[PDB]
Symmetry: D2
Subunit: 488 residues, 4 copies
């Protein structure tokens, strides 16, 4: 075990006053990684009062002073990339080959990006007439809250905290109870970089208690949430009933990958693989509906199976391991229920469909890489997000058909097309109802690129210049230099 994990409030670790704890499990072994204290209602109020004090100090600094502090945190994150990745691997089950290459690297990339943009955050000036003009300030919201998910814990903490801090706010962050550990490390790193006390506080806890207290607190101006649709609805509802808050939500999806009639099938299979089996399928943007032309289906299926042969499950710290267990045993039970529904509805199982067995697997939350084919639009595994390593392959005949079927979903997060044809690529992409679209690739999410969902996949965006601005609020100021006229 690790030492008991405490709350992080005002630049130090502190015990919760709730009397409550929870355990985070190592999904490779089933053993308790750490006992973690859960923030109660009083702890949340302490954190808000801490955040209000730190935010004022932070906002009073110059823009470049803030930039330098966030840049110092970047420098530390680069220095400690491997240490943090190992902790993320223990907490999440994702292979070290992923966490050491992606999770901290791309989280720190977004922090570095926003650090450089702070001096460029500007309001406007609007002349009305010789005797009057308007100017605007992009002011901090104040205290904002982030609620993270368990698939990319520190990356999510960085993608929410970076624009929030760069915009002059304090953020209170609640990591998922499944994966609370790296967020506490991030808090220490920020303070070491010189972040003022209270500007980034971390409250581990359960969604139903700590998360609810955050969403209900009257002095929190904005909630940013990553997770599933079901929890998103609770968060949105509670934020409205209790105290009005701006809200950002990234909620996953059922993203379609469209393989065109002129696609190279090796390229198409490589993209489909990376869109389904990275992080053991636990990625919001995964292309879990793979639409393949009927004329290519059989050959595509054989290419996918060949690549499934390249998946290497094993020791998560071994260099050649590229597939992990799922994040938790309850999550695995849910994925197995989806797989069983696929079988009972007649989807054709090409590989996988069961847990992994044997030495080194019996005690971990492993699900084999699973591919179904001959899938149809009404199947449960086609309609619902599984968030495991389960690819659904669907045949199609014509371009208008596949666009309709790709869009006939309540989800809207990502989409992609594989085609060498100029007109086909742009023409199809422009008709797809998704916020993140990839042409002849999958998964790259540059700091510069706004990402978020259409329809039930989200509200608002993350990354890009617009997200820095979305963590400010506009104040419009009219200077009236002429004589004021009253009609009374």
């Amino acid at each position: 075990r690790m030492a008991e994990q405490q709350l992080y409030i005002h630049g130090k670790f502190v015990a919760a006053t709730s009397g409550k704890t929870f355990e985070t499990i190592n999904p490779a072994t089933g053993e308790v990684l750490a006992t973690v204290q859960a923030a109660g209602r009083e702890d949340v109020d302490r954190a808000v009062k801490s955040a209000q004090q730190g935010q004022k100090v932070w906002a009073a600094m110059s823009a470049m002073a803030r930039s330098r502090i966030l840049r110092k945190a970047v420098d530390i994150l680069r220095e400690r990339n491997d240490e943090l990745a190992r902790l993320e691997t223990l907490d999440t089950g994702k292979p070290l080959s992923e966490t050491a290459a992606v999770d901290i690297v791309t989280g720190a990339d977004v922090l570095e990006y926003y650090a450089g943009l702070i001096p460029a955050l500007e309001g406007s000036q609007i002349p009305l007439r010789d005797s009057s003009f308007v100017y605007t300030r992009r002011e901090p919201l104040g205290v904002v809250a982030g609620i993270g998910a368990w698939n990319y814990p520190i990356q999510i903490a960085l993608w929410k905290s970076a624009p929030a801090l760069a915009a002059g706010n304090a953020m209170i962050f609640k990591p998922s109870e499944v994966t609370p550990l790296t967020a506490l490390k991030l808090a220490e790193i920020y303070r070491e970089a010189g972040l003022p006390d209270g500007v980034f506080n971390v409250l581990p806890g359960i969604g139903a208690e700590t998360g609810q207290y955050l969403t209900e607190h009257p002095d929190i101006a904005k909630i940013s949430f990553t997770g599933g649709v079901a929890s998103g609805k609770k968060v949105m509802a509670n934020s409205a009933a209790s105290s009005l808050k701006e809200v950002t939500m990234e909620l996953g999806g059922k993203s379609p990958l469209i393989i065109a009639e002129d696609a190279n099938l090796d390229l198409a299979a490589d993209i489909a693989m990376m869109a389904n089996f990275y992080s053991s399928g636990q990625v919001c943007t995964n292309g879990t509906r793979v639409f393949v032309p009927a004329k290519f289906k059989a050959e595509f299926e054989h290419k996918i199976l060949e690549r499934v042969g390249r998946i290497r499950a094993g020791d998560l710290f071994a260099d050649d391991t590229n597939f992990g267990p799922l994040v938790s045993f309850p999550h695995r039970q849910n994925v197995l229920r989806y797989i069983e529904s696929g079988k009972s509805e007649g989807a054709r199982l090409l590989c996988g469909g069961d847990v992994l067995k044997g030495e080194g697997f019996d005690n971990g939350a492993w699900v084999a890489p699973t591919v179904f084919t001959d899938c149809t639009d009404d199947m449960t595994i086609v309609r619902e997000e599984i968030f495991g390593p389960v690819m659904s392959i669907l045949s199609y005949d014509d371009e208008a058909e596949v666009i309709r079927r790709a869009n006939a979903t309540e989800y809207g997060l990502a989409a992609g097309v594989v085609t060498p044809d100029l007109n086909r690529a742009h023409r199809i992409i422009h008709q797809l109802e998704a916020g993140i679209c990839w042409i002849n690739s999958w998964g790259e999410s540059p700091a510069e690129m706004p990402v978020g969902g259409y329809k039930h996949s989200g509200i608002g965006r993350e990354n890009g210049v617009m997200t820095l601005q979305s963590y400010t609020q506009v104040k419009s100021i009219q200077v009236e230099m002429g004589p004021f006229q009253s009609i009374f």
Copy 2:
């Protein structure tokens, strides 16, 4: 008495299938203006299918073709200004001296503004490397819904529909049951201007039925709401619980007007009057907490009393009338309950405080212009929005005190300061927690100026370039021209 008012769906009036109606009255006389049909659940669904069909036509046109149609609607609104003002006066009770100068004029100003901006709505292009780049599209949300309030019915309809339509969306608009008539005229005007059938549908009805159906419909992408906090919470809950929707809300406030120690008291009194008694106090941005230095309070009160004597209640179509009844008898009752709480909590009644009586008043929802003084921060009339003609005068001593008291509220809509001093004006305004700030004036809301609330006074903004962008959704598109690498 007008003919029975029908729903407006797909470029024509159509009967509701709900079997339900309501009546709108003239609040100055109690006479029934019209029987109005109320949209049922099936009517809403028909309106959404109409909007989906029209939106596709509208979005496929060129940007300048859309601009020209909205400009033609501006032209018609200018020509019919006085006619529409008369109807608005009948429906709302606001004096014709206001409705003919403000309501349609500023609503049409915003439509005119956005009409010219359609061709400037652009995405971005982000170079990643020689072999890859990103571009973004600002795509229409699709079908959006607007929910109006009764204090500025046609202006609210124009401020919501103008950016929504200019961004390429269709809007379904539900006016308040208290004041449904001008929204129906607006629907006819848009069709006359060449707006494609279905792009602006109008569904009169009750909030508890028609409004809820709109917030719950799965194919509406965004709700924009103007009204009170209680109804906003209901709207937010239903919009999230049913189908995730973007949400904008303007919810009123308790805005402070700060008279500085160096202010001219004639200017201060004129601003305070215009900040409290325009539209009979039924304005979201009204400066209903008037902070006056103790050394000036008695003279300030005398100047307010002089100006209150100039308030001219009477025939709403007479040019010199500058004060009307409240919009409804239920609303006047709420204002009267607040007046009674002010008296019972020890506030000093400076003037007013009762219903108006006599010929021309007995049948209308008239309340005398009312001023309380000797107020303290804990009184109900100081803490809560009244939305009638009730000014609360508070004394203060020093600048730090007045800033703290001005900000000690859950609301955040507007604020203002009266001072000739350069440093004092900008220094105080920058510390106030409000989205709309006026220096040496009150009430002007240019089309260019984003307006909306901090804290519990709202979510999002209206007007300005940013609100056009807020009625689009960003699609990010990565073009990968290099070879894609899979780790499988």
Copy 3:
């Protein structure tokens, strides 16, 4: 009667005592005698512009927007009348002038009218006690100098952003094509533009154009024309009074036909890239690079399409090819055609004046195509500004990029290919400001256009050009106590 100057909302006699003649290039007859603005006329126009600019800038943004939109409405109403005049003055067929010249000029005015209210400064917080805000102020009086190939379009593309940004503009049309600019000045006044905000000074470049470039109270010059005159303008502006200068100077733009291109599509693009306005378009794709394996078939497709060109009565619905703008310009184009023959280019079609009844009296040059061209030929290196296409064989993609870029010009370029990677990959490597994929010639009001290298300075159209007609004033408000070290 002589056509007069337009100063302060009325036609007024020049004080120069000087005139020139504009010719109808289809007949050689004098279309009109036009007065030429002298140095005193320029000074009068500047004082008029200074007075009108102050009125115009004091109006609200939306008031300015409405006035420019009224001018758009008048241009739409008078489209056909103005097009007939442009045809008389320029020789371009009415099928062109009535479809493009006023239509696209008015498109740009309409665009900027709607963008005026969006012209905003910025606000920068420095610290609690100080902030900066900026204003985008008008330059004041600006000058535009037009060319003869698109006279009223050029007047509108220059005046629209200048006026929308709150400036007055003094506009000098080319002496070859002065008439439509004078009609535009009347239309602006009719729309409610304040007197002096748009003045028109016909004259010669060597006199009126020089006087404008030298005047001390003109804040900016925007110039369209040739490189030779562009240097003269730049030289005179430097000697006299510091001014911002924007320039669009033509080019030798390459059209790259890829190995996977459909040759009917490529030939159609090549035709529109070379023979619209009788080849008198700055952005024309006059170096057509064709894969060697496609060359013979492409040449046949070009020969078929060139043979179908309908030269004739400029007001006839089916005419799609006109004479050149002037007889001196025709002589210059014929010298280039002769250099192509004498330097060993193979003449595929055309190469001479058109002859016979209906052509003998006009400045006609046949649509002309050379092939077997090489990069050292004069017709390949120098802008001809007539209907002269140069077809060049190439073997490899890297080769054609080198050759496309091996020019001092940089105005436009294009590629014909159905391949996603090829289209973007090639375009990103071309050194040109205006790039077309599987098309040619469309110039949306939203799209900034201008040249790399010797093809220009600055841009026209797009939001950025509205801003380029303002100057930034930065204003710091210091609310804290100022510290002096003395």
Copy 4:
């Protein structure tokens, strides 16, 4: 005396091939600081070919890779601040109290600012119709040239090279022959930070030879020039005659300082001192026309005299020295001719008017702090930039007059007003024809704030986001996905 200084081309010092040298003088002693090689026509061509090669390497890197390299150069500049400040003091005569606090600090501030903005440099995307769209790229110009002035040598070098490099260009920089030394140090620092060889080359030389060779070279795409009007005309002419190049110029001015009738005269005097005698009056933005109300003129003069009496001329490396000699003895001769013209034209000499004398001054190019009063608008010292420590005080009666007289100049660089009144401050500033305006202050030039001249004081701007964009050129790209129609 230092070693002979070489050219800096392609990441190393290299001998000039011109066979020519020049000397830079220490203006405090008259001694030769160094012999410096002068770049010839062949040396410029070699530097251009070096720059073309390095620029391609630099532009091919990621935006953030470039950001990190420029940030490393910032880090080195901070560490070497005192070393560089001392060299600048020796070369320019400016007190170390200035060079160690302002010159490198604000030069590095601008580099740090642009380093963070590189990832935010974006093109646009414009939808035309379903079958066609436009996108733009902001491409590097290629090789650009900067020509520096002698009053702020390393700051000018940083203010030009920072946006040029951040936009992806290589820059060839020619420092003034009076002050060539710190630009050579900067070149070494860029290489140490990882700037690719050739991206920043430095060519000392004479304006008439090296500068002209740069302005004439056919493969240089843009010239950025700081200096006087006379040389700016030479640069403009030669740049046009040779090869069309974008040219940016900052050319000094005769900037007005307007003291309002309600101004505190101690504040006004302090502002006037800082606007005239910093860097011994050798500042482009100096407020050398000080407009004072007639009723306050005598008292203002008495306040200026006391403050002039506190000026501490002496050892330039002593902490309490705040006034230095002029940059050169030829420049002093020109300033003394202006002073004599003031005397002969009837201006009243309030103080100074001569060189400083005595031990420690006889060998330096010192001019006493000089104030003229009773000045008139036709006087030479009022109309022409002196670039020495010479203040002209002009009386005025009313606001409309002083605005007219402030604007009655061919120059337009800066301006300021001193007033506590809100309306007066904004009203006056909005009417002044200058690009840089200060209210109740003088001299601060934040990296965020675009700076440059109206009228004869310059073309284009420096600093601010816009200057980064001005070092790119726009490429517009239309994608036509529909069938192209030819009319032939």
